[PDB]
Write a protein that binds this ligand. Sequence first.
Ligand SMILES: N[C@@H](CCC(=O)N[C@@H](CS[C@@H]1c2ccccc2-c2ccccc2[C@H]1O)C(=O)NCC(=O)O)C(=O)O
Ligand SMILES: N[C@@H](CCC(=O)N[C@@H](CS[C@@H]1c2ccccc2-c2ccccc2[C@H]1O)C(=O)NCC(=O)O)C(=O)O
Lengths: 217, 217
Amino acid sequence: PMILGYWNVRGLTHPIRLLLEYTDSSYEEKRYAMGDAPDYDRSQWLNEKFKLGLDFPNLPYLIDGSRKITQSNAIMRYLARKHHLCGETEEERIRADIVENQVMDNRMQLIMLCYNPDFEKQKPEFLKTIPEKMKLYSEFLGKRPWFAGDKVTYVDFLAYDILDQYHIFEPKCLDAFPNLKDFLARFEGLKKISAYMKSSRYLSTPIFSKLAQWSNK
Amino acid sequence: PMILGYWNVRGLTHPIRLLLEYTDSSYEEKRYAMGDAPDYDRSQWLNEKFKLGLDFPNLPYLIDGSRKITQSNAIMRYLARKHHLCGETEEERIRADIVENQVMDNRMQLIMLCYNPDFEKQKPEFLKTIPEKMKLYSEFLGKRPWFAGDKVTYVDFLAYDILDQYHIFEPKCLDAFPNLKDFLARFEGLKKISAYMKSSRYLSTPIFSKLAQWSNK
Ligand SMILES: N[C@@H](CCC(=O)N[C@@H](CS[C@@H]1c2ccccc2-c2ccccc2[C@H]1O)C(=O)NCC(=O)O)C(=O)O
Ligand SMILES: N[C@@H](CCC(=O)N[C@@H](CS[C@@H]1c2ccccc2-c2ccccc2[C@H]1O)C(=O)NCC(=O)O)C(=O)O
């Protein structure tokens, strides 16, 4: 089977595991335990970082035989092509490309913060920006069932992850956007997702580990 | 024709203009002003940011008829598909997907620094990592003429921008990687490239303007 390499948290892998499962992909996971604090030791990673034959060594990685991939987005695209979950029209391709890029921006923004020693201080002015963040996705999706269109695609995976993460962070963040809650429910409804999601293996959380300001566990 | 919206800067637009030209695109520009120190005023942008009918309001943007694309990479990709500047084989795509993601990471890395209040201190430390970064590009590239393979692709535009920029920051950063040095010369060679670059409407510098801790002009 393929090997998926990542740290011991939800993270950037949330959408990959969700993808793999959805597609019934055959895979094994390769969990990297990060040392504790202070340390936060990454030796277990660092010790093989350059020994896996990775183009630009990183976490997460997917090894599918001779095929060695880094860059979560890359990993995603790779699995999308494999299972045909890319946009089928230019329109769709564009929507997915914007979305893919957009999720990362927002993901990064949150991440940045939860790892900001000075959290508490900014943790409020930050929450000031979420409704706009959310409204963006809201207007975009509009009435479509899926982010690219009528057909589910890989970016739904990313979209799902991101929305869930904000929600989780700011529980009300979605009350104003019913379309967005419908989506969450619709993705959660995909038959292979519900089981997986109720699985012992499955760790809804936490995108973030020990190093975290909000959720250091 | 097509319209391109950006900040008086080079930044994210650099790869875009380069591709726009390469492909002989016919387009107009809508340049916006970034208020100064302090201020760093973007009224205009802000006065209209919400009036363009764009999906995720942002700079830059490219309007091509019905087509309104935000996110620089999406922009890049839309132009790539249009002129067949994408990877053609599965292998070419992976390389492309990887490099693209990799370039942005690296760009952000440098931008974050340039935008850090504690830049002077951070700098030396940041310098220390260059070789490694550079190294991965060099090896990933190996002996290929282009990042994805035998033919120029959009990622070449990404890569050149970024390599050109690290090279200005750390003029020696490349001495140990001649494939890289060739790549730069070779990229600058492309007929339509030299052509545009020689032109009077070409802006190399800088990636960052005002705010910029490094390259504030
Ligand atoms: N652009 C890349 C980013 C990859 C990334 O930065 N990887 C970090 C982990 S994600 C990173 C993180 C680190 C530790 C713990 C948690 C996280 C995490 C979780 C969720 C979201 C993002 C993060 C980042 O801090 C890493 O540890 N790489 C190993 C290395 O560089 O040698 C991608 O999308 O794959
Ligand atoms: N992920 C998006 C990034 C878009 C974005 O961050 N754009 C910023 C300007 S570029 C941005 C930047 C901002 C300030 C100063 C410098 C920079 C910069 C300079 C060079 C390269 C990249 C940047 C970005 O950090 C912006 O002003 N958007 C309009 C808005 O805010 O509504 C993309 O790739 O398109």
